[PDB]
Amino acid sequence: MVLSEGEWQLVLHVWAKVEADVAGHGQDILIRLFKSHPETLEKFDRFKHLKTEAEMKASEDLKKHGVTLLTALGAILKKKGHHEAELKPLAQSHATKHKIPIKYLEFISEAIIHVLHSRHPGNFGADAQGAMNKALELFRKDIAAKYKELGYQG
Length: 154
Ligand code: HEM
Description:
By secondary structure, this protein is mainly alpha-helical. The protein has one domain (about 1-154): Globin-like (Orthogonal Bundle), CATH 1.10.490.10. The protein is built from seven helices and no strands. It has helices spanning about 5-20, 20-35, 55-60, 60-75, 85-100, 100-120, 125-150. The longest helix has 25 residues, at about 125-150. It is globular, with a radius of gyration of 15 Å. It starts with a helix and ends with a helix. Protoporphyrin IX containing FE (HEM) binds near residues 94 and 104. Protoporphyrin IX containing FE binds next to α4, α5 and α6. The PDB classes it as oxygen storage. The entry lists the keywords oxygen storage.
């Protein structure tokens, strides 16, 4: 698939707001993911033991990882579809080391869209949400193709 420049502008316009607070957004997103789909928490051996949202909010480690996660995603969105190089090491570690099924990348895509919608209503109307969804679907499709080449397709 291919996004138009107008769709990329709607995606990078709301992403510029997310970047004003990367650690806060990283925390909200991971907590929304773990609450909504608790089975995903099991994949993080580092966080597995967190029982409540209050423990999640207070974990400095969790917040550090949320910044690592969003910084990598941001670098991929800013490529505007030319992300082949960025996608390689990410597809290799998530398929071979972490073992993250495509379904879980769909679940965190849902969490990203929920959080931007709650925090940035003015910059995340229907058209901006359709463009962000297209951008994350492109990301998932390309990662899924690489997972296949790597021998995982999960
Ligand atoms: C927007 C999607 C995602 C991005 C851009 C992302 C990015 C990253 C990055 C940059 C790292 C550190 C380097 C590496 O190991 O590759 C990482 C580590 C990891 N990711 Fe992801 N990730 C994504 C989705 C997920 C999802 C959905 C899960 C699990 C349900 C997951 C599980 C993990 C685990 C277990 C690690 C290692 C954490 C720790 O022990 O250090 N990732 N991810």
